[PDB]
Design a protein around this ligand. Structure first.
Ligand SMILES: O=C(O)c1cccc(CP(=O)(O)O)n1
Ligand SMILES: [Zn+2]
Ligand SMILES: [Zn+2]
Length: 218
């Protein structure tokens, strides 16, 4: 009996959604994503683990007057993409990078209906930016930046107290990718990881230290 989906306000127009799954070798894993409001329109930053929780999440915001304009998934693992099939069935636009869609396709999973390619991409120009720091947790992991609020969604790339599941990780590249992320977003007020609590910009530093440490054990 996994805990319920939770939705809590992080800042003006920015909510954190947390869903839960039992994953072998890890136990009950919490997963944070965002919902970002731009006027009367809501954007999902990562989907919950499941269709059920994705539907709950969507229902919560629609019942409060927000139209769901789209979702973006930060990498191909199901804790970011589990909801895409359900969103597609409701004609809600889903986005992922070209690489992410390729990895979903390779794994026989449903793909996002929209893809983007390149280091930077505006999901919503001047409001929601996507940035690729390079391989780390996965080859495809991206982060989402909210310039108006100085909030960085780091997804499963931000790992301040341990790197987590290394199955698809690029441990060689992660310290350099972390370095780039830190340089770009040292100015962040808040950094939102997938699996640990919201913090400030120090989470960027800690991730870099954890990545360097993980690489050291060769
Ligand atoms: O390191 C991680 O991001 C991590 C670890 C355990 C579990 C999960 C969730 P999934 O099994 O969907 O990758 N993620
Ligand atoms: Zn992952
Ligand atoms: Zn994860």
């Amino acid at each position: 009996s996994l805990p319920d989906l939770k939705i809590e306000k992080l800042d003006e127009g920015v909510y954190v959604h947390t869903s839960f799954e039992e994953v072998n070798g890890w136990g009950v894993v919490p997963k944070h994503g965002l919902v970002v409001l731009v006027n009367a329109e809501a954007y999902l930053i990562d989907t919950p683990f499941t269709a059920k929780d994705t539907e709950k999440l969507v229902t919560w915001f629609v019942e409060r007057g927000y139209k769901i304009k789209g979702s973006i998934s930060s990498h191909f693992h199901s804790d970011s993409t589990g909801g895409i099939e359900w969103l597609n069935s409701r004609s809600i636009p889903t986005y992922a990078s070209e690489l992410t869609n390729e990895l979903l396709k390779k794994d026989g999973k449903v793909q996002a209906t929209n893809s983007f390619s390149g280091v930077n991409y505006w999901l919503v120009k001047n409001k929601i930016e996507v940035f690729y720091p390079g391989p780390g947790h996965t080859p495809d992991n991206v982060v989402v930046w909210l310039p108006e609020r100085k909030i960085l969604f780091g997804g499963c790339f931000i790992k301040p107290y341990g790197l987590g599941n290394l199955g698809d990780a690029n441990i060689e590249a992660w310290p350099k990718s972390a370095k780039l992320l830190k340089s770009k977003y040292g100015k962040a007020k808040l950094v939102v990881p997938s699996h640990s609590e919201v913090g400030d910009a120090s989470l960027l530093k800690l991730t870099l230290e954890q990545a360097v440490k993980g690489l050291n054990e060769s």
